[model samples]
Target: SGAIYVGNYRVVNRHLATHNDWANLVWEDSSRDLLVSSTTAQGCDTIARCDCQTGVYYCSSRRKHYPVSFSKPSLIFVEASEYYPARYQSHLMLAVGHSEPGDCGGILRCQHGVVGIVSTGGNGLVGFADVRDLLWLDE
Candidate 1:
């Protein structure tokens, strides 16, 4: 089959790195994808394809909603950055600012098109895999 159900959604393809570097690409079933605008610091822009839903929930104790705001995350190639260790050389870095543990698997989008898939995140950064790379492979 070309699709696999991931509980809340169905994925038609996937590309996940086997190395220590955290990266993954999970392509959702095409018909189920969404078209939305990305709200950013610069300005809002039309996006062609957004593959996932970003939800924010209120916490009673915190008295504020947890911000899963990935609307403005920036992608950086960390293949040779001295700040990152050698283990994550092939991964794409994300400037997500702050993300919770549950933030894994979040979509990193730009101009409405998904560019990276969240594999791991902590201390205001995230690691993602490329979406196009996964789409290039056969099931």
Candidate 2:
């Protein structure tokens, strides 16, 4: 696992898990914060960039070719959240196509505000969960 720092607060990311719904909700006692992440994420000791997908794609508007990486082009907008049955029976999560497995517990920053949590992705798609209400409960 690895460590994440929010200002002076430090979070030790070590919860490795997976689920049928593909969303993992982790609780850290030291930070007293609920962290959510994907089961596909890998931990590390130091900072290192993730590997990129092969080949280059062209952006018509930008008129440039760019190689695709696991952590580029963050989820900018979500039209709506999706609901699943049973345990995950609510519109608390959304899935997008991103390859960064280590984006575990990463923030889904929509424009300037943090909106979602990196939950899962191994099927060429990444899942994000909204923990806003959960946070409220912890209060």
Please report the candidate that would top TM-score against the real structure. 1
TM-score of 1: 0.35
Off by over 4 Å in 1: 1-86, 135-139
lDDT of candidate 2 over 74-128, digit per residue (tens): 3333222231122331223434344344555554433223333444444555444
Error of 2 at 19 (Å): 22
Instruction: Quantify all predictions' global Cα lDDT against the true fold.
Output: 0.35, 0.34
- Residue 60 local lDDT, model 1: 31
Residue 21 of model 2: what lDDT?
18
Model 2: CA > 4 A from native: 1-92, 135-139
Worst 10 residues of 1 by lDDT: 30-39
Residue-wise C-alpha lDDT for candidate 1, range 52-115, written one tens digit per residue? 3343322232334443443333343333222234243232443444444444445445544545
C-alpha positional error of residue 103 in candidate 2 after TM-score superposition, expressed in Å: 2.2
